[PDB]
Each structure stands twice: as C-alpha cells, then as structure tokens.
C-alpha cells in the first residue's frame, strides 16, 4: 500500500457486498456497490472531482482564480465542496432556503459560499440565482452536472471498471437509480463494451416515472426523479426502467439497516428494491445483479426516511 497525496486520491474504488436476508426469495444474486463509502458518503464525490479536474486539465479553470458555481441542494454540493476545499477553489452553491439546516452546516464547514433561494421556486429558483451569479462573476464557472460530460465519463473510467473487475466479469445486470444519469450512462456503457449481454436497469420514482411515459411529479426518493431527461443520460443504453415508490424504497432502506447492518439513503432502498425484484424473476436464476447504493443513510436523519424511529426517539424518556 501507499499514502494518498490528498483526499481526492481517496475517491472511488468503493466495495461490493452481497445482500443476504433482504434478498429472501431471490433466485438471482444481488451485490451492492457501496458508494456510501466514498470519502464524503456519496457517489457524487466522484463527479465532484471529475468535473473540477476536467476543467483544470482543459485549462478552463485555475485554483484561487476561478469561482466554481453550481445549483444543488443534493450530494453534488458536498462532492464539489470537499474537492474544491482540497484543491483551493472558491465554491458557490445555490439551493432553496427550504433545504434543512444540517445540509448547510456541512457545505459551510468546507468553506462553501452558500446562497439560498426562494423555497417556493425550488431548484428552478436556485438555477436562476446560479446563472445570475455566473453573469456577475468575472472568473465564474458553472459545472452543470446534468450537462457536463465529465459526469458520466468518470463512471465510465472508474465506477464501471471497478464493477466489472469486482464481480469477476460475471455481472448480468446493473441496477442504477437515475438522478443525472451519469452513473448508469457512464458505467453502463463500459460494462456493455465488456459484455453486450449485460442488461442495464434504470430506476425512477413511480411518482415521477417520466422515462416510462409518466408525467413528472413530487416524490421523496432524494437523489433521483429529476422530473426531466438529463442531457448526460443516454436512454438508448437502458435495457429496462424499473419503478419504485417512495414507500417501497423507505421500507427497503429500513430493512437494509435492520437485517443487513447497512444504513443506506432512501435512493439506495430504491435500487435495492428494484434489484431484488429483478433477482426474483425466475428466468434470472443464477444471475448477478449489482445495484448502486449512492449514499449513506446518516446524512438523512431529518428526512422522512427516519420519521418512525425519529418520533420514537424523541418520545422516549429516561429509566431510573
């Protein structure tokens, strides 16, 4: 072994683990790619670095000169943040003021310059403020995770290979929750090049299943269901779109912790749920499905993912 030059060399190479008791009834086999083990708990630690790095290399940005700007009340904020911190880049993040406190404490801790927007305008308002800021900023540079090719390209260079080599090339299906689409599109493309028979299953909210003809709407599965088809997503690579409800995902996420000792985010419950359904299809007996667990569940303690246990925790008094 060796010592990392810096935190950025710690990104990727996340572990693969088999789902045991939650996968009851499966004739197929399900392995989870724990992106929750990234330096900052999520898969965005990958694109956070990639998008920055790709700009540097293309000479588009210089530390302490360029001002990174990006609208996101999600994991991309953190990914970029910790990476900007290590590399010495000023980062500005926009997000609806709605987004709970805890989610700001973290970006601030990294020296992020936070700009909250009208909570009623959602991400649409955040995006505006971001471009408005871009216009105002001399050396401003917006990353645009849904447009930026460095997003899927990193998954094609790391995530995909990692899975291929980690499963021994035996992977039959790749289950991925679709947010920007960078993961399913990048990693998917690679796996497909290794084995054309590798099926890619995209996962979206039954409440906002737009890739299935559905109309966009609100759901609770943070991390996915953008309510629109991202530029980086390559729908042609998707072999099947599986839909999961917020409730399913939440129940699964909860089973993953209780039965597997895996404290995952709700979107992980989504992929886990889908992956398992697929693994239960008789024709898939013997097949290896790798589902991606995008984030660790501890960052979502305030969210609905823990409403039950949370109310229980507050309602409990001490025993003498």
């Amino acid at each position: 072994s060796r010592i990392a030059k810096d935190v950025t060399e710690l990104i990727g190479n996340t572990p693969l683990v088999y789902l045991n008791n939650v996968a009851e009834g499966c004739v197929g086999r399900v392995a989870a790619k724990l992106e929750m083990m990234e330096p900052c708990s999520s898969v965005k630690d990958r694109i956070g670095f990639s998008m920055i790095s790709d700009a540097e290399k293309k000479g588009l940005i210089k530390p302490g000169e360029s001002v990174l700007i990006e609208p996101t009340s999600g994991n991309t904020g953190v990914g970029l943040a910790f990476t900007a911190a290590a590399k010495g880049y000023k980062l500005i993040i926009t997000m609806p003021a709605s987004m709970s406190t805890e989610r700001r404490i973290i970006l601030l801790a990294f020296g992020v310059e936070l700009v909250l927007t009208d909570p009623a305008k959602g991400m649409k308002g955040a995006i505006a403020k971001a471009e408005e800021i871009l216009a105002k900023t001399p050396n401003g540079y917006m990353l645009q995770q849904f447009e930026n090719p460095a997003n899927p390209k990193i998954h094609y260079e790391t995530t995909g290979p990692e899975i291929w080599k980690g499963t021994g090339g035996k992977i039959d299906g790749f289950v991925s929750g679709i947010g920007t689409g960078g993961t399913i599109t990048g990693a998917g493309k690679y796996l497909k090049e290794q084995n054309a028979n590798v099926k890619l299953y995209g996962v979206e909210p039954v409440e906002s299943a737009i890739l299935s003809g559905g109309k966009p709407g609100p759901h609770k599965i943070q991390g996915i269901g953008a309510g629109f088809i991202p530029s980086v997503l390559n729908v042609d690579l998707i072999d099947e779109v599986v839909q999961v409800s917020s409730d399913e995902s939440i129940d699964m996420a909860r089973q993953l912790a209780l039965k597997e000792g895996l404290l995952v985010g709700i979107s992980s419950g989504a992929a886990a749920a889908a992956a398992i359904k697929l693994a239960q299809r008789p024709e898939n007996a013997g097949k290896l499905f790798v589902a991606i667990f995008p984030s660790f569940g501890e960052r979502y303690l305030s969210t609905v993912l823990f409403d039950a246990t949370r109310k229980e925790a507050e309602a409990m008094t001490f025993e003498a």
Binding site: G74, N75, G122, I224
Partner: peptide, 8 residues
C-alpha cells in the same frame, strides 16, 4: 408551481 424540489 411545477415541482422542481429534487435533491441531486
């Protein structure tokens, strides 16, 4: 109000 409150 078109729901655009996603967390990505």
């Amino acid at each position: 109000t078109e729901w655009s409150d996603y967390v990505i």
